[PDB]
């Protein structure tokens, strides 16, 4: 009955953009006007999803204070991009990813508009915060307790008539937070109140196994920038002369020729349709970021993780192990025979398999992009009648 | 809505199964028990979508080699295999569900005889699905095809008619065969945007035009403003390496960057050395490439067409590569959303000039952008699930 003008505040990067786009499309499907702040790198992708784009220039084009400060400057960059573009015509709603939460909430404070937080990672409240656990494990102070960071945030927050102490503002919970995870994957899930919606992951003729009885393995380390020909060769060697059929997605940087001849039961591709392979897979060998792990569990496929290939993968990998949904290979266990052994043990573990099938069920019932849009619209109902 | 037991009856084949799958998942998300009739070839895909599988044995396992080179009555044989395939699905579903029928039968248009007979015998409401044009008293793609082929309606062929009268009678149906064939379902979910439908204005509220299930490690172009062409002929069982080589030749030493998706049956090594601005892959993520593309050169199946238009990319069509592509291809040309190349028009220079002309055509550009908006506003699986749940509310709450 109402068209809403909805502004997305998001940082550039595959991991931050991709999970959001299903929601952007479902809201545009519903007749809402989507504006989305991003860089030229993701502009075309965001427009294809149905949104109008506001371009910002990314900063990513004492080491931790510098990581902290640039983080602040990136929020400032997105903040100023959105203000200049929208100007004397505020949107109805600000939806922002956790990374630019400074930008998002300040836009909402400056326009007097409600906001929604988006997260493709674990939710935070007073009982669990992944960010607090990370700072702790690295012996870092909370950024708010860092003078140089604290100083800039005081200035920034004052400009926007915010007098809230920096550490508290930092820890405030949004009116609504859409969490793109199934609830059972969330640490301390039971403590998370009504303002948190665990909606799960957003998600060519496809690939078909050449031999219908063959156990299928998917190997992927994402679309890496740095190249691991050695690992893919070791995987090829590991499953040569076994009943397995192995599909290796090597990304857009590595030339499949580089891997040399492959046996007939191993295939390598820069790009593969992941879900079509996972639908047939008995296991998946992967880096273990949140995205990768949930795609596998959405298809009921147990995991062997190699989290040293992905820096973000640590918390997600840790959770997989914690829940008994997969195993992990250390960098000293990457000889072909070791890879084989780990994959076979995991694939044969019927306890892990049943846990993963229950996770598949929890993903399915989570609700997806349609529910995430229903949540957005419902929220707008409450704070904007 | 309370959990319902919903049965999907579908034929095997990517073009029939894939568009249905978004709806399957969205219904399963809502708590519904989904059972889905298919073959082993698609059993994994359907299970991953959230359905339990009832297997059937396809006539097309062994009707591969009987009809390739025709003797006289090949036309009649084609109709008879269609009927047998409907019967294969009907028998499998009845055997599997036995004395415990589902609450609702959702059938694809190809097995409509199976779907409607299951619904009659079980005394249940039914929903029709189609990935192609809807039919009513004003328009029927099949009637136009038979007409253009100079062949009789299958109901007017003696061998087919006799089988069908007998089968219908076994389900307490004495409706004349041709009349029955044309009856309109209580609800039809059409996976097309309404504007793409011929005689769209004549379709009443029993037809929901929900559009294609939408698309979306991302591929990036080599320069920000590189003109990008996507070339795809689908997952061709046939080797057309010459065409891909011709495409590569066409754009060598031009600023274009060409991405060729050659499918899972062709080794890209077969193509030989490619120019540095041309890349070939068995699989590519179509959406990532289309988001940057200025044009798409494609066979013109309804699936591939709507994918291109979802991204606002105009098409150059080569429909002779896919017999299934003629209706969609003709619609694209009729609407001015693309051009077409014939078999004699496939020399490299012909390909390059055709693509350049199409990509520069502002009028096409604008009509395609209107089609993109239609598709984006069509509603998709969430709307399709809403329509199914609402229909249940009315006819079997
Ligand atoms: Ca891009
Ligand atoms: Ca299959
Ligand atoms: Cl129809």
SS (H, E, C) chain A: CCCCEEEEECCCCHHHHHHHHHHHHHHHHCCCEEEEEECHHHHHHHHHCCCEEEECCCCCCCHHHHHHHHHHHHHHHHHHHHHHHHCCCCCCEEEEECCCHHHHHHHHHHHCCCEEEEECCCCCCCCCCHHHHHHHHCCCCCHHHCHHHHHHHHHHHHHCCCCCCHHHHHHCCCCEEEECCCHHHCCCHHHCCCCEEECCCCCCCCCCCCCCCCCEEEEECCCCCCCCHHHHHHHHHHHCCCCCEEEEECCCCCCHHHHCCCCCCEEEECCCCHHHHHHHEEEEEECCCHHHHHHHHHCCCCEEECHHHCCCHHHHHHHHHHCCCEEECCCCCCCHHHHHHHHHHHHCCHHHHHHHHHHHHHHHCCCHHHHHHHHHHHHHHHHCC
Provide the 3-class DSSP secondary structure of residue B252.
coil
Q: How many angstroms separate the Cα of A192 from the Cα of each of A61, A187, A269, A380, B197?
A: 37, 10, 41, 21, 47
Q: Does B273 touch chain A (CB under 8 A)?
A: no
Angle (nearest 5°) at CA A33 between A377 and A4: 40
Known binding-site residue numbers of B: 41, 45
Q: Kindly list the strands in the beta sheet with A266-269, ordered across the sheet, starting from the edge strand earlier in the chain.
A: A266-269, A245-249, A216-220, A281-286, A303-305, A326-328
Candidates A31, A48, A284, partner chain B, best to mutate (most B CBs within 10 A): A48
Strands B104-108 and B5-9: parallel
A45 assigned to a ligand binding site: yes
Cα–Cα distance, A149 to A72 (Å, whole number): 8
Nearest C-alpha in A relative to B22: A203
Is A364 in contact with B48 (Cβ distance < 8 A)?
no
Probe site for chain A from B48, B53, B221, B267 (most A CB atoms < 10 A): B48
Is A298's Cβ below 8 Å from some Cβ in B? Answer: yes
Question: Is B31–A271 a contact, with Cβ atoms under 8 angstroms apart?
Answer: no
Q: Check if the beta carbon of residue A194 is closer than 8 Å to that of residue A179.
A: no
What percentage of chain B's residues is helix, strand, coil (to nearest 5)? 50, 15, 40
Q: Which two tokens stand for residue A363?
A: 């993903």
**Min CA distance, B144 vs chain A (Å)?**
27
What are the residue ranges of helices labelled H in chain B?
14-29, 40-48, 74-97, 112-122, 141-149, 158-169, 177-181, 241-251, 286-290, 302-310, 326-334, 348-360, 362-376, 380-395
Q: What are the structural domains, with CATH classification, of chain A?
A: 2-203+366-385 (3.40.50.2000), 204-365 (3.40.50.2000)
Using CA atoms in the order A108, A111, A113, A119, what is the torsion angle rounded to 10 degrees? -20
Cα–Cα dist B384/B231, whole Å: 31
Cross-chain residue pair B264–A366, CB shorter than 8 Å: no
Q: Which of B45, B50, B291 sits opposite A206 (nearest CB)?
A: B45
Q: Which residues sit opposite A198 in a β-bridge?
A: A179
| Annotated binding residue A305 | no
Q: Which of A28, A39, A22 is nearest to A5 (CA)?
A: A28
Phi, psi angles (nearest 5°) of residue B191: -85, 45
* Contact: B218, A223; criterion CB under 8 Å: yes
Is A14 in the B-facing interface, judged by CB distances under 8 Å? Answer: yes
A206 touches chain B (CB under 8 A): yes
B386 vs A contacts (CB less than 8 Å) = none
Out of B214, B219, B283, whose CB is closest to A204?
A: B283
Taking the C-alpha atoms of residue B243 and residue B237, their distance in angstroms, rounded to an integer, is 15
Cα–Cα distance measured from residue B197 to residue B208, given in angstroms and rounded to the nearest whole number? 11
Q: Give contacts of B219 with chain A, Cβ < 8 Å.
A: 252, 271
d(CA A271, CA A274): 9
Q: From CA A233, how far away is CA A213, in angstroms rounded?
A: 24
Nearest CA in chain A to B284: A271
Q: Tokens 């029928």 label which residue? A: B101
Ligand closest to Cα of B293 equals 1
* B228-232 vs B207-209, strand pairing mode: unpaired
Residue B231: which H helix or E strand, with range?
strand B228-232
Question: Which tokens is B147 given?
Answer: 């007409």
How many angstroms is it from B317 CA to the middle of ligand 1?
A: 25
Q: Contact B217/A371, CB-based, under 8 Å? A: no
Method: X-ray
Question: Cβ of A201 under 8 Å from any chain B Cβ?
Answer: no
> Under an 8 A CB cutoff, do B379 and A21 touch?
no
Q: Give residue B137 CA to ligand 3 midpoint distance, Å.
A: 11
Hey, how many other C-beta atoms are within 10 angstroms of the C-beta on B121?
Answer: 16
């Amino acid at each position: 009955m109402r068209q809403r003008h909805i502004l997305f505040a998001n940082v550039q990067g595959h991991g931050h953009v991709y999970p959001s786009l299903g929601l952007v499309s479902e809201l545009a499907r519903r007749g809402h006007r989507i504006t989305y702040v991003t860089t030229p790198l993701f502009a075309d992708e965001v427009k294809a999803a149905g949104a109008e784009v506001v371009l910002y220039k990314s900063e990513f084009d004492d080491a931790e204070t510098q990581l902290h400060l640039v983080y602040v400057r990136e929020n400032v960059a997105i903040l100023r991009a959105a203000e200049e573009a929208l100007g004397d015509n505020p949107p109805d709603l600000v939806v922002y990813d956790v990374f630019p939460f400074i930008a998002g909430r300040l836009l909402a404070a400056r326009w007097d508009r409600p906001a929604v937080r988006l997260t493709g990672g674990f939710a935070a409240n007073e009982h669990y915060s992944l960010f607090k656990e990370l700072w702790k494990s690295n012996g870092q102070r909370h950024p708010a307790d860092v003078e140089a960071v604290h100083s800039v945030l005081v200035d920034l927050l004052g400009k926007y008539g915010v007098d809230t102490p920096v550490k508290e503002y930092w820890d405030e919970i949004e009116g609504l937070t859409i969490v793109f995870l199934p609830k059972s994957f969330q640490p301390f899930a039971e403590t998370f109140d009504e303002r948190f919606a665990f909606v799960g992951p957003t998600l060519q003729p496809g690939w078909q196994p050449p031999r219908p009885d063959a156990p299928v393995l998917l190997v992927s380390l994402g679309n890496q920038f740095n190249e691991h020909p050695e690992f893919f060769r070791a995987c090829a060697q590991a499953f040569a002369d076994t009943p397995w059929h192995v599909v290796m997605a090597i990304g857009g940087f590595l030339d499949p020729a580089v891997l040399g001849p492959l046996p007939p039961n191993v295939e390598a591709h820069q790009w593969i349709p992941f879900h079509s392979v996972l639908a047939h897979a008995r296991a998946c060998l992967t880096h273990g970021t949140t995205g990768a792990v949930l795609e596998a569990f959405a298809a009921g496929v147990p995991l062997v993780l190699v989290p040293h290939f992905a820096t973000e993968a640590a918390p997600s990998a840790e959770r997989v192990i914690e829940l008994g949904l997969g195993s992990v290979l250390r960098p000293d266990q990457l000889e072909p025979a070791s890879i084989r052994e780990a994959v076979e043990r995991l694939a044969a573990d019927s306890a892990v398999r049943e846990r993963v099938r229950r996770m598949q069920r929890d993903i399915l019932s989570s609700g997806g992009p349609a529910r995430a849009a229903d949540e957005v619209e419902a929220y707008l109902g409450r704070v904007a009648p």
